[PDB]
Amino acid sequence: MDGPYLQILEQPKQRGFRFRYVCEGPSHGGLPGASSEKNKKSYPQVKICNYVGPAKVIVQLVTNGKNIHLHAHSLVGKHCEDGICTVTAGPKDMVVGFANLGILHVTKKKVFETLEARMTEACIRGYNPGLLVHPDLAYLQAEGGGDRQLGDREKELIRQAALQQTKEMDLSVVRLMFTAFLPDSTGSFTRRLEPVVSDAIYDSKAPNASNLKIVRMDRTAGCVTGGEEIYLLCDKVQKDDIQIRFYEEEENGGVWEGFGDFSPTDVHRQFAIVFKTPKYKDINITKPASVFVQLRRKSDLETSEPKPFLYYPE
Amino acid sequence: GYVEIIEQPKQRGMRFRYKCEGRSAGSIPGERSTDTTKTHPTIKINGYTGPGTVRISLVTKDPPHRPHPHELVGKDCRDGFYEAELCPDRCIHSFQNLGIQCVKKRDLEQAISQRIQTNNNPFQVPIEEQRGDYDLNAVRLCFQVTVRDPSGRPLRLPPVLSHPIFDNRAPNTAELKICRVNRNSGSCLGGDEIFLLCDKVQKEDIEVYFTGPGWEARGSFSQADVHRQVAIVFRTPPYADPSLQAPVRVSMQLRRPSDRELSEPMEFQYLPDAAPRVLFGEWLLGEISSGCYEGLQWLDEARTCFRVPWKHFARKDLSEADARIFKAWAVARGRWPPSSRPPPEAETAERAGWKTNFRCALRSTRRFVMLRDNSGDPADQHKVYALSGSLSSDSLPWLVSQLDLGQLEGVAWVNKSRTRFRIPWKHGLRQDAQQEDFGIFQAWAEATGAYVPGRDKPDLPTWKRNFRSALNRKEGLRLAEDRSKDPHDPHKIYEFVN
DNA sequence: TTGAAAGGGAGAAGTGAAAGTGGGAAATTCCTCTGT
DNA sequence: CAGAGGAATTTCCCACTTTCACTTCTCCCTTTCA
Numbered sequence: 017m018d019g020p021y022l023q024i025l026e027q028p029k030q031r032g033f034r035f036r037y038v039c040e041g042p043s044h045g046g047l048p049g050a051s052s053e054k055n056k057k058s059y060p061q062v063k064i065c066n067y068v069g070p071a072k073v074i075v076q077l078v079t080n081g082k083n084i085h086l087h088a089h090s091l092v093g094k095h096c097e098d099g100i101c102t103v104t105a106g107p108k109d110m111v112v113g114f115a116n117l118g119i120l121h122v123t124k125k126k127v128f129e130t131l132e133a134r135m136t137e138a139c140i141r142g143y144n145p146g147l148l149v150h151p152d153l154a155y156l157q158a159e160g161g162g163d164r165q166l167g168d169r170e171k172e173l174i175r176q177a178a179l180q181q182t183k184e185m186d187l188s189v190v191r192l193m194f195t196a197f198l199p200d201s202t203g204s205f206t207r208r209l210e211p212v213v214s215d216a217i218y219d220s221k222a223p224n225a226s227n228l229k230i231v232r233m234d235r236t237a238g239c240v241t242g243g244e245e246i247y248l249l250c251d252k253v254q255k256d257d258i259q260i261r262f263y264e265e266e267e268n269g270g271v272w273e274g275f276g277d278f279s280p281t282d283v284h285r286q287f288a289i290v291f292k293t294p295k296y297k298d299i300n301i302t303k304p305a306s307v308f309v310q311l312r313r314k315s316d317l318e319t320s321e322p323k324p325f326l327y328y329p330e
Numbered sequence: 331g332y333v334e335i336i337e338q339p340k341q342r343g344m345r346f347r348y349k350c351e352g353r354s355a356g357s358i359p360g361e362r363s364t365d366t367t368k369t370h371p372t373i374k375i376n377g378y379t380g381p382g383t384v385r386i387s388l389v390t391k392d393p394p395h396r397p398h399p400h401e402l403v404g405k406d407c408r409d410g411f412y413e414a415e416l417c418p419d420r421c422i423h424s425f426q427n428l429g430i431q432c433v434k435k436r437d438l439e440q441a442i443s444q445r446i447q448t449n450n451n452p453f454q455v456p457i458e459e460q461r462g463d464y465d466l467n468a469v470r471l472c473f474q475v476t477v478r479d480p481s482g483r484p485l486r487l488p489p490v491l492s493h494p495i496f497d498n499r500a501p502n503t504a505e506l507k508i509c510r511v512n513r514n515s516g517s518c519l520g521g522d523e524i525f526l527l528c529d530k531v532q533k534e535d536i537e538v539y540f541t542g543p544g545w546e547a548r549g550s551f552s553q554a555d556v557h558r559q560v561a562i563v564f565r566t567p568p569y570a571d572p573s574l575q576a577p578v579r580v581s582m583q584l585r586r587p588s589d590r591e592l593s594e595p596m597e598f599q600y601l602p603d604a605a606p607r608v609l610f611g612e613w614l615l616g617e618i619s620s621g622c623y624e625g626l627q628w629l630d631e632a633r634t635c636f637r638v639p640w641k642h643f644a645r646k647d648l649s650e651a652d653a654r655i656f657k658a659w660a661v662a663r664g665r666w667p668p669s670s671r672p673p674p675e676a677e678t679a680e681r682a683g684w685k686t687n688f689r690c691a692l693r694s695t696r697r698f699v700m701l702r703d704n705s706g707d708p709a710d711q712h713k714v715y716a717l718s719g720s721l722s723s724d725s726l727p728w729l730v731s732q733l734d735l736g737q738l739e740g741v742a743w744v745n746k747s748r749t750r751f752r753i754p755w756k757h758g759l760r761q762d763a764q765q766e767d768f769g770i771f772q773a774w775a776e777a778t779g780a781y782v783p784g785r786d787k788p789d790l791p792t793w794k795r796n797f798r799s800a801l802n803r804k805e806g807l808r809l810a811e812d813r814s815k816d817p818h819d820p821h822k823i824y825e826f827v828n
Numbered sequence: 829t830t831g832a833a834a835g836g837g838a839g840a841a842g843t844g845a846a847a848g849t850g851g852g853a854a855a856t857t858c859c860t861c862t863g864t
Numbered sequence: 865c866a867g868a869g870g871a872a873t874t875t876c877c878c879a880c881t882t883t884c885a886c887t888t889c890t891c892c893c894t895t896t897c898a
Binding site: 344353499609644646663760761 | 865866867868869879880881882886887888889890891895896897898
């Protein structure tokens with residue numbers, strides 16, 4: 017009862033990738049796949065199911081809001097042009113790989129013109145209908161031909177959407193939208209399947225999206241009594257949105273949590289936190305119990321890898 | 331008469347401001363200013379009190395005191411400098427509205443041109459010395475007063491320079507300040523680990539400086555111990571007297587080596603009895619010195635030359651020791667899991683890459699030079715290198731060019747349309763085998779640095795093999811005839827075909 | 829009870845230049861507290 | 865209601881790593897010589 021469709025095999029990793037301004041030069045590594053690791057790298061992948069011989073897949077940067085829109089940042093590298101990646105695939109293989117994909121960080125002052133130009137290409141071209149742009153004449157598809165006379169009135173609509181969207185635009189997060197195409201009777205790739213959107217990709221350079229990490233600390237132990245001062249070194253955090261949490265998984269789906277004591281003034285230049293230790297689950301205990309410590313961002317509950325902390329009796 | 335500065339401007343602490351900040355951005359405080367009491371730059375004009383003028387401009391901190399690109403802004407400031415009328419009844423003059431506006435690097439040339447365009451050039455530095463990088467983090471005020479000689483004509487007196495004024499916002503010229511210390515006490519033996527929270531420092535130009543009653547010590551930490559420029563984790567140095575019977579209160583302060591700048595001290599009393607960065611050149615010298623890599627050794631007492639084992643990795647007897655230094659580099663840089671203290675024997679697939687990463691890194695470094703490529707003599711395959719500057723004493727198209735030249739005997743043309751050429755090809759095992767017989771072969775080896783008539787034993791089969799190997803699988807060229815076997819006149823014939 | 833070297837073919841290794849990588853930090857711009 | 869100073873946004877560039885575009889080697893036989 018189905019038909020040919022596009023499936024995202026490997027999703028792009030969500031955190032840790034650095035977006036790049038054009039002044040930083042081309043290529044600084046391509047967006048990693050969620051499975052990629054240390055010395056064994058991987059990349060985002062799509063698979064055209066219920067095959068269709070040759071096919072050409074494209075990728076676009078869409079926003080992350082409720083309303084999937086066109087982002088102002090661009091994709092660059094390998095097979096890209098105007099922030100759109102276009103790759104061929106399908107002779108025999110139906111799994112496309114996407115290495116060498118970089119995210120060009122557009123400038124702030126720059127976002128309005130880029131968005132207007134990027135959307136204008138869409139109204140005129142026959143890629144994705146009046147979805148990513150605005151609820152209107154969503155025709156001008158890949159049905160008849162590829163190109164449309166931008167009416168005088170239509171231009172006002174793009175400008176208005178561009179102005180509204182620039183304000184909504186979040187330059188720290190972005191999403192990938194894959195669109196596949198199957199050959200025409202003429203051999204042309206016009207047969208458009210359904211678009212698929214990927215997980216949100218956060219800019220590792222954004223303080224709020226920064227991947228948290230405990231770089232080094234004073235001591236890794238203290239008395240269950242708590243109240244001892246600690247000196248912790250970490251990656252960039254925001255003084256008003258950071259907390260140090262201690263915890264130990266308890267018997268039978270249980271978990272005790274404790275919070276380091278400190279004020280935002282104790283956060284030094286975004287890179288260090290001097291705090292006092294919380295009191296352990298129960299004062300008077302038998303022998304040294306070990307727990308875990310972790311930085312945690314309030315606003316989104318994101319966390320750093322845990323680091324062992326040893327509690328000992330008084 | 332003459333100008334004298336009575337109140338110098340505070341040197342550190344105030345940041346320069348960009349036009350973009352504009353707004354109300356304070357003014358240059360005076361040497362003795364405190365949080366509670368601000369003072370201002372002030373001059374005294376010895377030997378004169380009356381009408382006159384004063385221009386204060388900005389100039390380079392160092393000797394060729396050229397007009398600095400930044401500019402003064404505030405009351406009575408125009409075109410980059412300050413100029414006002416003197417007070418006829420006061421011989422001491424105060425300037426309380428001097429602000430320094432820094433120009434962007436992108437706009438530096440226009441700024442310098444404006445300076446010449448307005449004659450703001452106190453020491454009339456000729457347009458020549460007036461060029462070359464400028465230190466945009468430091469400036470000196472230049473006072474240019476003009477009184478009047480005994481009734482009548484004006485009179486400019488020698489210009490005076492102030493102490494330099496450094497940009498407090500710029501990272502390598504900012505004011506040093508310790509903010510919080512882990513522990514302010516420790517053993518007289520030293521070695522206690524301390525966490526110090528500070529203001530922006532540069533991990534490659536900063537130290538923890540201890541002092542006191544005629545004594546000086548320095549905490550030890552590698553640049554890797556400086557965290558994101560605002561935190562240093564080091565170890566206490568040993569105290570002068572390694573035998574305390576009582577605690578001693580010493581001084582602890584941040585120190586910027588390059589210019590001696592110091593921060594306010596933090597008390598510290600002694601009491602009674604982080605992986606460093608692997609830079610390739612420093613790392614390589616250490617490994618050669620270690621004596622732990624058979625084959626990797628110094629070739630002299632000065633330690634300016636050294637050999638690196640370099641056996642071709644296609645060899646089937648290739649041992650661990652043969653590739654030990656190449657693997658050591660991979661492991662130090664985290665591209666290969668270390669030992670015990672899994673692993674996969676797919677370790678020999680990795681070795682070619684380990685060698686190239688080592689060769690390429692060595693080359694990028696620009697710190698070494700190759701003296702001899704002994705990766706030949708089968709017995710001991712290795713390369714010899716010398717450190718930069720100390721005894722640097724280094725010691726299809728090609729064929730197309732060669733075809734026209736046909737210099738040496740044996741080669742020439744048979745096809746007067748360029749494509750069908752004849753190359754000699756006698757079998758080396760012939761008693762009549764000549765040296766210049768493989769002349770065309772010899773040309774390729776020499777023309778690639780492969781062979782040098784003076785410093786290189788001749789290898790005839792290799793010259794023949796390499797000349798041949800280059801041609802072989804080269805799509806766009808192939809063989810014709812083959813009188814190679816011909817007992818009388820050995821020779822082949824090739825041709826092209828794009 | 830195929831001897832000593834030279835010759836070939838494949839294809840992995842080796843090469844210097846020139847991009848590509850991953851990060852940290854410097855330059856610039858904004859903007860919030862301090863304390864109206 | 866500045867205006868000192870903490871951050872956020874952008875720009876540079878260090879110090880190698882990988883790839884590009886070819887060229888050479890070791891392997892493993894074959895041929896050729898005397």
